[PDB]
Nucleic acid binder design. Structure first.
Ligand SMILES: COC(=O)C[C@](O)(CCCC(C)(C)O)C(=O)O[C@@H]1C(OC)=C[C@]23CCCN2CCc2cc4c(cc2[C@H]13)OCO4
Ligand SMILES: [Mg+2]
Ligand SMILES: [Mg+2]
Ligand SMILES: [Mg+2]
Ligand SMILES: [Mg+2]
Ligand SMILES: [Mg+2]
Ligand SMILES: [Mg+2]
Ligand SMILES: [Mg+2]
Ligand SMILES: [Mg+2]
Ligand SMILES: [Mg+2]
Ligand SMILES: [Mg+2]
Ligand SMILES: [Mg+2]
Ligand SMILES: [Mg+2]
Ligand SMILES: [Mg+2]
Ligand SMILES: [Mg+2]
Ligand SMILES: [Mg+2]
Ligand SMILES: [Mg+2]
Ligand SMILES: [Mg+2]
Ligand SMILES: [Mg+2]
Ligand SMILES: [Mg+2]
Ligand SMILES: [Mg+2]
Ligand SMILES: [Mg+2]
Ligand SMILES: [Mg+2]
Ligand SMILES: [Mg+2]
Ligand SMILES: [Mg+2]
Ligand SMILES: [Mg+2]
Ligand SMILES: [Mg+2]
Ligand SMILES: [Mg+2]
Ligand SMILES: [Mg+2]
Ligand SMILES: [Mg+2]
Ligand SMILES: [Mg+2]
Ligand SMILES: [Mg+2]
Ligand SMILES: [Mg+2]
Ligand SMILES: [Mg+2]
Ligand SMILES: [Mg+2]
Ligand SMILES: [Mg+2]
Ligand SMILES: [Mg+2]
Ligand SMILES: [Mg+2]
Ligand SMILES: [Mg+2]
Ligand SMILES: [Mg+2]
Ligand SMILES: [Mg+2]
Ligand SMILES: [Mg+2]
Ligand SMILES: [Mg+2]
Ligand SMILES: [Mg+2]
Ligand SMILES: [Mg+2]
Ligand SMILES: [Mg+2]
Ligand SMILES: [Mg+2]
Ligand SMILES: [Mg+2]
Ligand SMILES: [Mg+2]
Ligand SMILES: [Mg+2]
Ligand SMILES: [Mg+2]
Ligand SMILES: [Mg+2]
Ligand SMILES: [Mg+2]
Ligand SMILES: [Mg+2]
Ligand SMILES: [Mg+2]
Ligand SMILES: [Mg+2]
Ligand SMILES: [Mg+2]
Ligand SMILES: [Mg+2]
Ligand SMILES: [Mg+2]
Lengths: 98, 177, 136, 48, 48
RNA sequence: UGUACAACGGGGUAUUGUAAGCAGUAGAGUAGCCUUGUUGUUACGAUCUGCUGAGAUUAAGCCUUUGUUGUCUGAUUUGU
RNA sequence: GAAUGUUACCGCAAUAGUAAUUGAACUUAGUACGAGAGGAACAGUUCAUUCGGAUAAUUGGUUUUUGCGGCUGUCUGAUCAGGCAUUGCCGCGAAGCUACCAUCCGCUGGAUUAUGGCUGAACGCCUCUAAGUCAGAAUCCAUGCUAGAACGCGGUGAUUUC
RNA sequence: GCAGUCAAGCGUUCAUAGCGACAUUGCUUUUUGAUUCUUCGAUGUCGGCUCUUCCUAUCAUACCGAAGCAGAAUUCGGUAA
RNA sequence: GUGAACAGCCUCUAGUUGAUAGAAUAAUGUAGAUAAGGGAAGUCGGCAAAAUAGAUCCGUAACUUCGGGAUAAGGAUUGGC
């Protein structure tokens, strides 16, 4: 059971809900409801319609803490050496100096 | 779906099969890159952390970092880019691609371990596979051993034994620069 | 439906009543298809017979190769526009009405179908399956 | 009470929707416990 | 209770739902739960 | 005289598509005073941006409520 | 809706009405039968037509929610906010109503007809028939469903004092 | 208009599977005639639309019997509105 | 004022605010509207209804009494500042 999104507005379309338009070139547009659908037929441009995801994304609305930092990294340092070359005499000769 | 897991510390890798949407479902709506806590997928991997690196859907199309979408599309690809190998100079070819958002339509998740959980995993943490080749260019040897331009490489090059049957041999690179 | 139809079609909303003209979407020569009947349909005082996705109609060609004009042939509905509902619960519609001309056995007359095709139609007629690009 | 929608896998071997999801409509009736307050005993008569 | 024991197949089939719509019925409902709505909407001029 | 009822008020739910007000280095440009500008300055300009998915409406046959205020015996008739 | 003491609740069921219809596919089966050409059906399953009774999660239609937004013309000095244009016009539009344009549901016992039979005399034989009798139809009667006789009825509750 | 009786014929052979001459007995009252009894101090004329109900001499559908019924297809007949 | 305008629509002056009234908003109406997909299949017949429309520019067939046919047909454009 997949939830779809509105190709015009970007809203979740839970099952069996809204309508589906198969354009002549076989691009498929889904609408959560008759509102997106009429704008879409009206050749309206989602980026200019203020309440749309696509609008809000473009006008950088609300996003705030997505541009807030995080904490994802590691710290390894485990030697394997080089296959067939005695991975034992590669750490005793790896005592370094400077 | 099948999980293809790598321990990039040991060079280890082994695949795991998971049948249980619930256990899977953690991976859904997750992109390539995003991290994932372990216990949710199995008790084995508890507190293991997983990085999602890619994978192939059924029909085998590959994912492609940063398409977003959880479907397929047909991109134009070039030299120097995922999921494509040019056959000719300046060749570009249109090709189907799977999105980088994990659906249940994937055949395989590819994952990479970032933190090790509370328990060892058999063919992964337990076993360690050597790096195949060693430093060949001058100052690369000088940095795999930390040497200063004093110590002189020639005797710090790697040395891979091998046998002829009754003649065991010795062959080192060819230091450049 | 009837002959050549292997499978059963679940009821789908009727879009094309008699007199409807649909786009011809094969490469046989015909530009449109004029519906004069719908195979396997019933009777009610005053009710117009109407076709839907994957129905066999009887048609004439109104615009097209003179060889294909002035005579009646079988054709098969491949795209609808009147929205219908599927059992997975979605209401969907195409942007045009389109069929392709066929023989009673349900075999095409043309070697290709231009445009998308309904799955309910693809399922129903193999040679309509054969000649398809995008289905549904 | 009213109606809503349901989604479920259909199990009809034979059907094109065997092992597929379907969305189906449902009513809901509010059904708190009924409470028993009496018994009434009927008898058969040739009048009914 | 039913007055006959239907064998049907259609009756006998033992359903088990997968998901129950719970979206608002006072309009074109978009959200199953307030949780879901806060999730998707973000923060508003009321709120915290 | 009580998990009473009603009028408002609050919360939910929904519909529209971003209120008024103020602000701006946004604006094709335009005038006016000179101390004629190494942003000269004062304003004007459809429109745009920000405060603002805001504002407005939401039972009149939507949902809900620890708040506010009020209501809680008039009339007629009936007997084996 | 007066009157059968009053009022209330729960029921019975006389009589009357009554409803479902038709098709295809799969499978049976390239089988039976046939030299061949051809070529079925019962059981099982999946859909469908025509008809009915509902229902409104969903989709669609409707719009005075004159709800929100937009537009022309004019009128309130401007602004704000509005008025008028027989609902000014336009896009969206909740609620309700609503569509094979939408979803859901449409019961199973008996007795029979034709007809094929059993036993079996009349008529030492023979006969489904004369006596007796088995099986039997989109029929009929029930079941089921809708009314409930306002002069058909049952069970039960409480029954007035200035 | 519809249905019989007789049975010379038709049907390779064979009257009656399916038909049936010459004759001959009937039914019906959406044919058309014949009549002129009712209405001329007036009973709104054709067709269609809509809608109900009835008849059966049954086109389909249920179950049958017959065939010049191998099958398939058909034809004839019954209970059937 | 808008506009080509004594058009329509809004206003000033003046004049009216007369037309039984109250409560509801069933069926059927009268008058005003909308309707998915199809698009005259409806019907004697496109009856009704819908579509078109101003202006500027581009473009304009048969045929002709040479005057026309012609806004033929077919196109684009149009606010605000
Ligand atoms: C030849 O047609 C007429 O005569 C028509 C009419 O005029 C009917 C019109 C009557 C009104 C004026 C009342 O419409 C008339 O006189 O009708 C009579 C009449 O008029 C009431 C009744 C008649 C006689 C008995 C019933 N019948 C029916 C109508 C009618 C129709 C006719 C007819 C006679 C009748 C008569 O001849 C042919 O078709
Ligand atoms: Mg709607
Ligand atoms: Mg609409
Ligand atoms: Mg070199
Ligand atoms: Mg073509
Ligand atoms: Mg008709
Ligand atoms: Mg092919
Ligand atoms: Mg805003
Ligand atoms: Mg009301
Ligand atoms: Mg309060
Ligand atoms: Mg009060
Ligand atoms: Mg009384
Ligand atoms: Mg076969
Ligand atoms: Mg033979
Ligand atoms: Mg609606
Ligand atoms: Mg308005
Ligand atoms: Mg201002
Ligand atoms: Mg006025
Ligand atoms: Mg006027
Ligand atoms: Mg129906
Ligand atoms: Mg009985
Ligand atoms: Mg016997
Ligand atoms: Mg008998
Ligand atoms: Mg007998
Ligand atoms: Mg006898
Ligand atoms: Mg029956
Ligand atoms: Mg029963
Ligand atoms: Mg019943
Ligand atoms: Mg009574
Ligand atoms: Mg009583
Ligand atoms: Mg003779
Ligand atoms: Mg013979
Ligand atoms: Mg002879
Ligand atoms: Mg006749
Ligand atoms: Mg007379
Ligand atoms: Mg006469
Ligand atoms: Mg007369
Ligand atoms: Mg008279
Ligand atoms: Mg009369
Ligand atoms: Mg009778
Ligand atoms: Mg009869
Ligand atoms: Mg013979
Ligand atoms: Mg019989
Ligand atoms: Mg009948
Ligand atoms: Mg009768
Ligand atoms: Mg006067
Ligand atoms: Mg008057
Ligand atoms: Mg229409
Ligand atoms: Mg058209
Ligand atoms: Mg016609
Ligand atoms: Mg036409
Ligand atoms: Mg007609
Ligand atoms: Mg005419
Ligand atoms: Mg005519
Ligand atoms: Mg007209
Ligand atoms: Mg229109
Ligand atoms: Mg002429
Ligand atoms: Mg002309
Ligand atoms: Mg301009």
């Amino acid at each position: 059971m997949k939830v779809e999104i509105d190709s015009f507005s970007g809203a979740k379309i839970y099952p069996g809900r809204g309508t589906l338009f198969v354009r002549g070139d076989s691009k498929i547009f889904r609408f959560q409801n008759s509102k997106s659908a009429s704008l879409f037929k009206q050749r309206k441009n989602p980026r200019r319609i203020a309440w749309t995801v696509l609008f809000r994304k473009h006008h950088k609305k609300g996003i705030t803490e997505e541009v807030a930092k995080k904490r994802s990294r590691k710290t390894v340092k485990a030697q394997r050496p080089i296959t067939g070359a005695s991975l034992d005499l590669i750490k005793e000769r790896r005592s370094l100096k400077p | 779906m099948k999980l293809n897991i790598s321990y990039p510390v040991n060079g280890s890798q082994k695949t795991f099969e998971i049948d249980d949407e619930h256990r899977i479902r953690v991976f859904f709506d997750k992109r390539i890159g995003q991290e994932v806590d372990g216990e949710a997928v199995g008790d084995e991997f508890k507190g293991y952390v997983f990085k999602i690196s890619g994978g192939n859907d059924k029909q085998g199309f590959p994912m492609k970092q940063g398409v977003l979408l959880p479907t397929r599309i047909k991109l134009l690809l070039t030299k120097n880019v995922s999921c494509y190998r040019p056959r000719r100079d300046g060749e570009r070819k249109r090709k189907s691609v799977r999105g980088a958002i994990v659906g249940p339509d994937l055949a395989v998740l590819a994952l990479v371990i970032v933190k090790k959980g509370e328990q060892e995993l058999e063919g992964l943490t337990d076993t360690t596979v050597p790096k195949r080749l060693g430093p060949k260019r001058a100052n690369n040897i000088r940095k795999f051993f930390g040497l200063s331009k004093e110590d002189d490489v020639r005797d710090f090059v790697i040395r891979r034994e091998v046998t002829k049957g009754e003649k065991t041999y010795t062959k080192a690179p060819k230091i450049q620069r | 439906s009837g002959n050549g139809a292997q499978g059963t079609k679940f009821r789908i909303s009727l879009g094309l009543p008699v007199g409807a003209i649909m786009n011809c979407a094969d490469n046989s020569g015909a530009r449109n298809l004029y519906i004069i009947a719908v195979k396997g349909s019933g009777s009610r005082l005053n009710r117009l017979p109407a076709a839907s996705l994957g129905d066999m109609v009887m048609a004439t060609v109104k615009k097209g190769k003179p060889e294909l004009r002035k005579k009646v042939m079988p054709a098969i509905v491949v795209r609808q526009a009147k929205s219908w509902r599927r059992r997975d619960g979605v209401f969907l519609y195409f942007e045009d009405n389109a069929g392709v001309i066929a023989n009673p056995k349900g075999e095409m007359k043309g070697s290709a179908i231009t445009g998308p095709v309904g799955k309910e139609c693809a399922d129903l007629w193999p040679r309509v399956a054969s000649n398809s690009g995008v289905v549904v | 009470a009213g109606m809503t929608t349901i989604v479920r896998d259909l199990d009809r071997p034979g059907s094109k929707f065997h092992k597929r999801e379907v969305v189906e409509a449902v009513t809901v009736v509010d059904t708190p416990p009924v409470v028993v307050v009496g018994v009434v005993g009927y008898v058969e008569t040739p009048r009914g | 209770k039913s007055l006959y024991t239907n064998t049907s197949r259609k009756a006998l089939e033992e359903v088990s739902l997968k998901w129950i719509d719970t979206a608002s019925k006072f309009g074109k409902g978009r959200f199953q739960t307030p949780a879901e709505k806060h999730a998707f909407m973000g923060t508003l001029k009321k709120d915290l």
